[PDB]
């Protein structure tokens, strides 16, 4: 499970096993929060992670899950978290500090365009996330999110993807960037089209097809 | 010796533990790649203006930044293989040195400090883009653009070298709103617009 996983991660891509000792977090745990100094990055190992910035006066605008890497931003240009990172189920972690990063990192250049790698992915993103913030219409962005979360954490389910996501139907509206009752009449909508099924903290995307079309 | 300021102050560089390469001219109104079109290569400007602009589902063309001496664009495609996020054009004559990625991978070889800095940039530049939720007015949106093109060109007679359609672009509202915001500016004299710069009041 863990070694499968964390050698995915971009900076344990390509490495062979090669104690910075890994923690365990509960559900609902802050594991740092906007506007604090920051020192340490992570690799999640299992478990996920919400990643949150507060309006003026809270939009999520990301789930993270196993292999990926959060709180890396303070870390690669030192500054104060640019957001907050919420466990929404148990997590096990594992982390480094700019020490230990920079250790591992001499060792190979090749970890260091990995790096490179993610952000500028994160950045190529960052332009169509916007673009849809200022251009989609909200049932659209809806389709989007649920693909978005289809494609990180989506199965096979006997032809059809079970998407888990483990988030409420007001985490789900955060990070749509709509109204909770927007969000579900979409969701509602779709469902009644048999294009997705809810179940809980799932949804079952029987039509990924026309879910793409709508998006 | 210039070539050796201009590069000093990239941000790739900010350590000085020379590095010449070998540069190209590119002329004013020029394509330097499309957005959508395979990239393998990111840029340096050392002389000229560049302006980096992505496709509006209304066509339209949203200018995202303003590139002059000194700064790096195109590197999202060495970094993370695919298409241009945005397209490249010269809005003077420009002068820059280029570098695909077997170059990228070399002078890393030799100089590794390069490697964090280009973590640093990036990292900077999402940073930057999370501060911004300013697109959650027009004449208020245009101000703050002359006041950023002023910090960048400016000397405070802004040599901006843009269009006013293009300046639009920069700001996200349409040619109607913001020539009418830049007619109102003129008139409180505050700016004055005389060809591609301006000049201020305040
Ligand atoms: C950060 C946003 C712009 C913005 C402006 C105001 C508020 C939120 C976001 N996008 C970009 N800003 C500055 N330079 C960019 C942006 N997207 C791509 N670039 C550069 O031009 C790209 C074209 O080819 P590339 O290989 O994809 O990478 C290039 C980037 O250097
Ligand atoms: C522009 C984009 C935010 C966004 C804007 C519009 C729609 C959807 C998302 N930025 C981010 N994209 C992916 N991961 C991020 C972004 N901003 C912060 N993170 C991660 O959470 C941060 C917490 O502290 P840190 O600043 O040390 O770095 C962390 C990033 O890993
Ligand atoms: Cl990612």
Redesign the pocket.
Known sequence: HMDEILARAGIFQGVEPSQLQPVDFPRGHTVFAEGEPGDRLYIIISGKVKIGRRAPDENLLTIMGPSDMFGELSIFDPGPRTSSATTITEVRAVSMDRDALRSWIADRPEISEQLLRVL?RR??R??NN?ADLIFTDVPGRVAKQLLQLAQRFGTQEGGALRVTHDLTQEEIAQLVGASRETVNKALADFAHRGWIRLEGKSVLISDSERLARRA
Request: charged fraction near 15%; hydrophobic fraction near 50%; aromatic fraction near 0%.
């Open positions: 500028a950045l190529r960052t332009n916007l």
